[PDB]
Design a protein around this motif. Structure first.
Motif, PDB file in Angstrom:
ATOM      1  N   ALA A 101      66.967  -5.726  -2.630  1.00 35.58           N
ATOM      2  CA  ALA A 101      66.621  -6.051  -1.255  1.00 35.58           C
ATOM      3  C   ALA A 101      66.004  -7.406  -1.105  1.00 35.58           C
ATOM      4  N   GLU A 102      66.123  -7.994   0.111  1.00 33.57           N
ATOM      5  CA  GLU A 102      65.630  -9.316   0.402  1.00 33.57           C
ATOM      6  C   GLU A 102      64.927  -9.268   1.747  1.00 33.57           C
ATOM      7  N   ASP A 103      63.588  -9.531   1.773  1.00 33.01           N
ATOM      8  CA  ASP A 103      62.725  -9.624   2.940  1.00 33.01           C
ATOM      9  C   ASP A 103      62.578  -8.358   3.705  1.00 33.01           C
ATOM     10  N   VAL A 104      61.492  -8.303   4.475  1.00 31.33           N
ATOM     11  CA  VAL A 104      61.148  -7.190   5.234  1.00 31.33           C
ATOM     12  C   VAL A 104      60.558  -7.654   6.531  1.00 31.33           C
ATOM     13  N   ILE A 105      59.820  -8.784   6.577  1.00 34.79           N
ATOM     14  CA  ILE A 105      59.094  -9.100   7.782  1.00 34.79           C
ATOM     15  C   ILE A 105      59.888  -9.217   9.003  1.00 34.79           C
ATOM     16  N   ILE A 106      61.100  -9.716   8.887  1.00 31.84           N
ATOM     17  CA  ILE A 106      61.926  -9.865  10.035  1.00 31.84           C
ATOM     18  C   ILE A 106      62.125  -8.559  10.640  1.00 31.84           C
ATOM     19  N   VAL A 107      62.311  -7.685   9.695  1.00 34.38           N
ATOM     20  CA  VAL A 107      62.695  -6.434  10.000  1.00 34.38           C
ATOM     21  C   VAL A 107      61.665  -5.755  10.679  1.00 34.38           C
ATOM     22  N   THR A 108      60.441  -6.169  10.539  1.00 34.66           N
ATOM     23  CA  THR A 108      59.409  -5.411  11.088  1.00 34.66           C
ATOM     24  C   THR A 108      59.496  -5.171  12.496  1.00 34.66           C
ATOM     25  N   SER A 109      59.756  -6.206  13.206  1.00 35.20           N
ATOM     26  CA  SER A 109      59.973  -6.076  14.553  1.00 35.20           C
ATOM     27  C   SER A 109      61.112  -5.219  14.814  1.00 35.20           C
ATOM     28  N   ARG A 166      54.129 -16.696   5.470  1.00 31.78           N
ATOM     29  CA  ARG A 166      55.218 -16.671   4.543  1.00 31.78           C
ATOM     30  C   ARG A 166      56.479 -17.007   5.203  1.00 31.78           C
ATOM     31  N   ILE A 167      56.692 -16.379   6.353  1.00 33.15           N
ATOM     32  CA  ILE A 167      57.819 -16.625   7.180  1.00 33.15           C
ATOM     33  C   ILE A 167      57.650 -17.923   7.751  1.00 33.15           C
ATOM     34  N   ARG A 168      56.458 -18.332   8.088  1.00 32.87           N
ATOM     35  CA  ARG A 168      56.244 -19.613   8.600  1.00 32.87           C
ATOM     36  C   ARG A 168      56.848 -20.659   7.741  1.00 32.87           C
ATOM     37  N   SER A 169      56.699 -20.493   6.443  1.00 34.12           N
ATOM     38  CA  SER A 169      57.251 -21.362   5.472  1.00 34.12           C
ATOM     39  C   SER A 169      58.747 -21.420   5.538  1.00 34.12           C
ATOM     40  N   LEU A 170      59.316 -20.404   6.124  1.00 33.34           N
ATOM     41  CA  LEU A 170      60.689 -20.131   6.088  1.00 33.34           C
ATOM     42  C   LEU A 170      61.225 -20.141   7.417  1.00 33.34           C
ATOM     43  N   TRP A 171      60.355 -20.515   8.319  1.00 37.86           N
ATOM     44  CA  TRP A 171      60.558 -20.490   9.694  1.00 37.86           C
ATOM     45  C   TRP A 171      61.644 -21.374  10.000  1.00 37.86           C
ATOM     46  N   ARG A 172      61.839 -22.323   9.103  1.00 36.59           N
ATOM     47  CA  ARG A 172      63.040 -23.127   9.256  1.00 36.59           C
ATOM     48  C   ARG A 172      64.147 -22.048   9.184  1.00 36.59           C
ATOM     49  N   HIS A 173      64.031 -21.187   8.176  1.00 32.53           N
ATOM     50  CA  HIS A 173      64.934 -20.061   7.911  1.00 32.53           C
ATOM     51  C   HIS A 173      66.338 -19.938   8.523  1.00 32.53           C
ATOM     52  N   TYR A 174      66.568 -20.532   9.684  1.00 30.32           N
ATOM     53  CA  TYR A 174      67.858 -20.458  10.365  1.00 30.32           C
ATOM     54  C   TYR A 174      68.090 -21.789  10.957  1.00 30.32           C
ATOM     55  N   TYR A 175      69.332 -22.043  11.438  1.00 25.53           N
ATOM     56  CA  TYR A 175      69.716 -23.326  11.979  1.00 25.53           C
ATOM     57  C   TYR A 175      70.680 -23.310  13.150  1.00 25.53           C
ATOM     58  N   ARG A 176      71.898 -22.799  12.945  1.00 22.76           N
ATOM     59  CA  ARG A 176      73.058 -22.959  13.792  1.00 22.76           C
ATOM     60  C   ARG A 176      72.831 -22.697  15.231  1.00 22.76           C
ATOM     61  N   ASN A 177      73.490 -23.459  16.094  1.00 21.75           N
ATOM     62  CA  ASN A 177      73.368 -23.261  17.533  1.00 21.75           C
ATOM     63  C   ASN A 177      71.986 -23.540  18.102  1.00 21.75           C
ATOM     64  N   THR A 178      71.237 -24.406  17.433  1.00 23.58           N
ATOM     65  CA  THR A 178      69.907 -24.755  17.903  1.00 23.58           C
ATOM     66  C   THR A 178      70.014 -25.872  18.934  1.00 23.58           C
TER      67      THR A 178
END
Lengths: 123, 139, 604, 272, 159
Positions: free
Chosen positions: D79-87, E56-68
């Protein structure tokens, strides 16, 4: 110099002694010194030599809660024995024999001098 | 109690297009397949009340053209297991209102998958009451 | 599960339809508003009237005590607000806030406020420091304002109930609710809050006989409850226990467990309908207005279950209704008598049965704990169930190796290691059973003495008591019997002979067993054997030990409490509250002993 | 019939602005197929998927929801990540039907971190309490994996068990016990009381009878003393049933060379 | 339009969001398990990404791109603390470069009584006038008022 003598020898590897002798006969019954599956579990066996008696203590410091450390064995007597020492099993982890001992020298020509009950407290 | 070691959905033609290995112990996809070759093949086109391979229970429903399988350990109750074996068997059947074929599968691939997940989920049988189920789902 | 529980019919009055009730905590006074139009304030404790006021003679809907303020707030449906300073009952001020039938007041405590809802379809806020300003008016109505409750938790935010069936929860920045939700299918009579700050529930009332729970943070109706027998006039949150109080339009009590949610019980004081309720915030005493009168009931234990090993761990379980999951405490450090101490943290347990007894094994060791009416005994370190069964009544064979039981009949069986002891098997009228060294069966307003091996009526003394504590070695024993108390000698030899001779008195027991040494007329908060010394509490809150012909107060305590434990070595007493701060006062046992011995002529 | 590589690029097209619920559903099916017969997996591919899957969530469409669960469910031990999922998760949870909820737990359970746990416990409390068993059932299974992972903290929960302990659905009745046993089976003692616990008790979703049998014997087996009063009680009952299997269950075990009580067994047998 | 509303969990961005979106709000914690939401405004079809930013996600908040293509950057106005310096600059610059293809409209939240330190200082600090650059607006709000909201959207719904 019984089966028990072998035990006199088995005991012998230790050197903190305060007398021993050769084992005469051993225990007619080993006693669990802690009852049935205790926080700590003891079965004890007692050994007689012509000079001393050693109680060597067989065991599984039971709970995985614990390891007992700074262990020594008190014995306190009613019908004679000269009390030389109480033994500490330096460390005892869970499910495991280790040895602790308690040692006495046996008076023989006295009226009332080798049958004894000794009182135990584990520290 | 995790009964399904694995579950397989099989041709007449001795192949498996679905299997979910509830638990694996000899690895690979591969390794499962070789097993098929023996077992299925051998069994093929004919079933048992009971069948065993080596202290493990061998379970499963057939069709003229199709094979269903469940594996568990033969070390335990025929009846329930059967009951189950059927439970699936029926449910789907009922559900389908049709005998699966090769056709059935292509006819709708999705349903299998979907099906597969609901009762048993890797190993144990969560879901059941097939009619219930059948009704229960549709979406 | 059983009502082996505290229910006390605390105080009664039969009267009218007492609509409203409001509590004076700060001194447990209670205010009640009647459908008579007269309102009265009582000290229930001795059924005594603190003051009564004829505010109006029209039914007086709303009431508050303003404790901070030291004044009592009153309103009647002359649409005026009358104020008294409760510090007499000297009436401070009057003015007309809401001009229609004024249903409810909710107060900000932290902040100097009085919130009111009234039937005018208006909620007004008035500021007392501003000297009853109408500071703000909250509106967003659709009907009369039947009830206001302040979420006091967030004083600041509050909720409103109306019978047009809806609830508005508001933010200050919303002199309107933040929103309205469409609660009832009837009307929302009432809105109430969930005692804990941690989670959040309201209960709202209806007579439709359906209950919905709501979680605000999510904002859901958590769930909706059914089962009922009659239009629930009211249902309430137990704040002490997790139970649901249901009330009816006929004044039916049904309780559902707010955990089992199983009907635990129905009670009838068919004093007709639940008009009001008000609860002790200390969560234990509650009052409700009924038609035929009102009744107040007292519903608590005084302790958790814990027993202390003299190493120094009082292992208790629970906290108050928390899981049992929490036992431990060997500590690690030292500090001054007056000053306070730190605990360790490592729970064990997470039982189910809810107890009310803890008793140690005689070596601390094996505790037998009873709860839900059955006894789990634990192997403690083990955290093992040492054993279980159902009780009625108990004695450990004091020795630390047997135990006795009173079966929920009443006829004795005793077990030593699950063997009944029938060598001893009177089964006479009892009252309670006492173990210890010497057997007590308390019976027929007498206390009767028994052997340990066969029964013998050793003695019977005059009356029955409440409790026994035995000296340690048994010897001099202390029996607590209301106000009054006695200290005794038990003299063996007589018995041995007498017994040998056999011919005796046992109606009385045999007059040739025990002697009555002296008696102190005593009230005990808690009490102690130090050996044969009775070190005791009094509920007058002096801790005294009766020593030497003397009773001395080592110290006097806030109000009285529970004896933590004196670990002798340390020679100190650990004192215990019930709120888990331990105080210690050292003595030094020897001093007592020194005294004991010398009088005995053991001067040397 | 069909092939993976192309597909792997193409799946993201659903993620491309493309509206046609069907199309993607199908494509998803295939992926699963590739997978079903056997498929390599890995991170990069996953990660890209992670952004890809994620946007796609204004879907209302229930069935649409289904599809998702499955996929996610696919990711568990890998599995990969969970936080997104949280919502998201939360969304199932608050989510009206019952349904949504069960799938989510189900992926979650091989995969996750202590930490969050606390929170999600609450949700558990709720599941534990709900009347439509199913979800509750859904909840349980997850736990097991969580037991895989650990589950000890799950233990803490015994209490809930009790509140739960009242049961009225057969299968369900069954499920509870399974857990329980595990739990107490680390413990003789209670069980002895448990027995008693059931002792007042008969059983709803039978199945329960059966595990219990193995069990009931299993203490006794070693010589959990008295066959005589307890066992026997069980037996007459066991005997009596048209749960012929149960009768059998007892029968099969008692394989005793002298015939412990040779006689009776023969009736049972006749019956067999 | 993938329009990203950014800020932390705990901001009370979320509060705003649904206040607008649904009319009604939700806790001062922005999301943990995201928002993707769709809004039609002016009947134009919009995707809101709402981030309870959390690290953590913040760090990854870039995490996505397309259609921005659009930013609501929620920043809390009165935030005296996390707002500027390395963090602020970094975020801004990074974002900018990465998606130079989208207007950055920063949202300053819970202005109440403003508990900032100068509207002027900050805007400058952010180099609001480093402008020679993409449609920008610096915009004031306290959530409860929603001190500038509709323009943001409105002015935005400009082509």
């Amino acid at each position: 110099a019984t089966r028990q003598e072998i035990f006199q020898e088995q005991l012998a590897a230790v050197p903190e002694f305060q007398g021993l002798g050769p084992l005469f006969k051993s225990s007619p019954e080993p006693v669990a010194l802690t009852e049935s599956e205790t926080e700590y579990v003891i079965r004890c066996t007692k050994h007689t030599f012509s000079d001393h008696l050693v109680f060597q203590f067989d065991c599984t410091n039971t709970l995985n809660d614990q390891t007992l450390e700074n262990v020594t064995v008190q014995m306190e007597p009613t019908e004679a024995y000269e009390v030389l020492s109480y033994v500490p099993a330096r460390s005892l982890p869970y499910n495991q024999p280790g040895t602790c001992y308690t040692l006495v020298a046996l008076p023989t020509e006295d009226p009332t001098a080798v049958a004894c009950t000794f009182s135990c407290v584990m520290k | 109690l995790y009964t399904v070691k694995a579950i397989l959905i099989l041709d007449n033609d001795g192949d498996r297009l679905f299997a979910k290995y509830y638990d694996d112990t000899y690895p690979s996809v591969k390794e499962q397949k070789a097993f098929e070759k023996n077992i299925f093949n051998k069994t093929h086109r004919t079933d048992s009340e009971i069948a065993l391979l080596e202290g493990l229970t061998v379970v499963y429903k057939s069709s003229i053209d199709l094979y269903f399988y469940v594996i568990g350990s033969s070390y335990e109750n025929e009846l329930m297991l059967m009951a189950v074996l059927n439970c699936l068997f029926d449910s789907l059947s009922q559900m389908l209102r049709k005998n699966v074929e090769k056709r059935a599968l292509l006819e709708n691939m999705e349903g299998l998958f979907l099906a597969v997940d609901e009762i048993v989920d890797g190993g144990v049988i969560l879901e059941s009451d097939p009619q219930q189920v059948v009704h229960r789902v549709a979406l | 599960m059983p009502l082996r529980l505290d229910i006390k019919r605390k105080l009664t009055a039969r009267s009218d339809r007492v609509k409203s009730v409001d509590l004076h905590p700060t001194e447990p006074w209670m205010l009640a508003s009647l459908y008579n139009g007269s309102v009265c304030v009582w000290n229930h404790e001795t059924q005594t009237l603190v003051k009564t006021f004829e505010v109006c003679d029209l039914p007086v809907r709303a009431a508050k005590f303003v404790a901070r303020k030291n004044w009592v707030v009153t309103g009647a449906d002359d649409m005026q607000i009358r104020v008294f300073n409760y510090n007499t009952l000297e009436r401070v001020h009057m003015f007309e806030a809401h001009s229609d039938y004024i249903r409810c007041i909710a107060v900000h405590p932290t902040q100097p406020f009085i919130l009111t809802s009234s039937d005018d379809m208006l909620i007004k806020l008035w500021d007392w420091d501003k000297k009853w300003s109408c500071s703000q008016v909250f509106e967003g109505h659709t009907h009369y304002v039947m009830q206001i409750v302040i979420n006091p938790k967030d004083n600041n935010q509050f909720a409103s109930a109306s019978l047009d069936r809806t609830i508005k929860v508001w933010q200050l920045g919303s002199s309107s609710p933040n929103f309205t939700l469409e609660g009832h299918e009837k009307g929302v009579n009432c809105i109430d809050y969930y005692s804990g700050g941690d989670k959040p529930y309201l209960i709202s009332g209806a007579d439709d006989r359906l209950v919905k729970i709501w979680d605000y943070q999510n904002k859901t109706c958590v769930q909706t409850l059914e089962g009922h027998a009659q239009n629930v006039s009211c249902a309430s949150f137990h704040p002490e226990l997790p139970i649901i109080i249901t009330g009816s339009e006929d004044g039916t009590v049904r309780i559902w467990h707010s955990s089992t949610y199983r009907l635990e019980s129905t009670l009838n004081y068919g004093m007709e309908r639940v008009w009001c309720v008000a609860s002790l915030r200390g969560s234990n005493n509650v009052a409700l207005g009924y038609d035929e009168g009102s009744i107040i009931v007292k519903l608590g234990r005084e302790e958790p279950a814990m027993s202390m090993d003299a190493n120094g761990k009082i292992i208790w379980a629970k906290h108050s209704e928390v899981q049992q999951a929490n036992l431990k405490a060997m500590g690690d450090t030292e500090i001054k008598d007056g000053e306070r101490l730190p605990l360790a943290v490592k729970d064990m347990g997470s039982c189910e049965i809810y107890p009310q007894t803890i008793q140690h094994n005689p070596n601390g060791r094996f505790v037998v704990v009873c709860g839900d009416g059955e006894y789990i005994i634990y192997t403690a370190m083990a955290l093992r169930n040492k054993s279980f069964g159902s009780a009625q009544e108990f004695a450990w064979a004091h020795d630390s190796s047997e135990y006795a039981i009173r079966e929920s009949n009443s006829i004795v069986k005793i077990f030593k290691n699950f063997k009944e002891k029938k060598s001893f098997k009177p089964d006479f009228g009892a009252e309670s059973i006492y173990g210890g060294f010497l057997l007590g069966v308390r019976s027929v307003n007498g206390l009767a003495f028994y052997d340990w091996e066969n029964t013998e009526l050793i003695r019977r003394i005059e009356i029955q008591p409440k409790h026994i504590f035995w000296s340690d070695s048994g010897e001099l024993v202390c029996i607590a019997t209301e106000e009054s108390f006695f200290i005794l000698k038990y003299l063996s030899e007589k018995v041995l002979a007498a017994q040998e001779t056999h011919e005796g008195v046992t109606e009385d027991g045999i007059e040739d067993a025990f002697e009555v040494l002296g008696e102190i007329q005593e009230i005990v908060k808690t009490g102690l054997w130090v050996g044969d010394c009775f070190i005791y509490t009094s509920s007058v809150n002096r801790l005294n030990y009766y020593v030497g012909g003397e009773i001395v107060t080592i110290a006097h305590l806030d109000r009285t409490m529970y004896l933590l434990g004196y670990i002798p070595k340390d020679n100190r007493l650990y004192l215990g509250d019930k709120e888990l701060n331990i105080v210690s006062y050292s003595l030094l046992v020897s001093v007592l002993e020194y005294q004991t011995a010398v009088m005995r002529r053991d001067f040397s | 019939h069909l092939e993976k590589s192309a597909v792997l690029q193409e799946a993201r097209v659903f993620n491309e602005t493309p509206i046609n619920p069907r199309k993607c559903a199908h494509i998803l099916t295939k992926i699963l197929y590739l997978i079903n017969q056997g498929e390599h997996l890995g991170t990069t591919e996953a990660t890209e998927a992670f952004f890809a899957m994620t946007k796609l969530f204004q879907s209302n469409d229930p069935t649409l929801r289904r599809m998702c669960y499955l996929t996610i469910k696919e990711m568990s031990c890998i599995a990969e990540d969970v936080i997104i999922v949280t919502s998201s998760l939360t969304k199932d949870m608050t989510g009206k039907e019952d349904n949504y909820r069960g799938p989510a737990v189900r992926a979650l359970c091989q995969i996750t971190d202590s930490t969050m746990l606390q929170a999600v416990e609450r949700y558990m409390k709720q599941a534990i309490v709900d009347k439509v068993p199913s979800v509750s059932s859904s909840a349980l299974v997850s736990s097991l994996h969580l037991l895989k992972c650990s589950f000890d903290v799950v233990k803490r929960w015994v209490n809930e068990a009790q509140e739960a302990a009242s049961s009225d659905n057969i299968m369900v009745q069954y499920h509870a016990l399974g857990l329980l046993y595990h739990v107490r089976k680390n413990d003789r003692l209670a069980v002895s009381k448990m027995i008693s616990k059931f002792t007042r008790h008969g059983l709803k979703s039978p199945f329960a009878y059966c595990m219990m049998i193995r069990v009931a014997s299993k203490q006794l087996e070693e010589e959990d003393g008295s066959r005589d009063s307890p066992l026997f009680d069980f037996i007459e009952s066991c005997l009596r049933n048209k749960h012929e299997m149960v009768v059998y269950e007892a029968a099969s075990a008692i394989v005793n060379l002298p015939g412990c009580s040779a006689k009776e067994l023969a009736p049972a047998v006749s019956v067999l | 339009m993938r329009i990203l509303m950014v800020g932390l969990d705990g901001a009370g961005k979320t509060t705003v969001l649904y206040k607008l979106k649904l009319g009604e709000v939700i806790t001062t914690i922005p999301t943990i398990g995201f928002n993707v939401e769709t809004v039609q405004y002016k009947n134009i079809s919009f995707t809101v990404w709402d981030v309870g930013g959390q690290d953590r996600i913040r760090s990854l908040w870039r995490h996505y791109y397309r259609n921005t293509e659009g930013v609501i950057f929620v920043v809390d106005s009165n935030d005296r603390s996390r707002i500027g310096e390395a963090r602020e600059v970094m975020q801004r610059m990074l974002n900018e470069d990465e998606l130079r293809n989208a207007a950055w409209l920063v949202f300053a939240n819970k202005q109440d009584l403003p508990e900032a330190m100068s509207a002027a200082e900050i805007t400058e600090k952010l180099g609001l006038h480093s402008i020679r650059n993409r449609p920008w607006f610096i915009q004031a709000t306290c959530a409860t008022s929603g001190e500038g909201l509709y323009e943001g959207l409105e002015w935005l719904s400009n082509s």
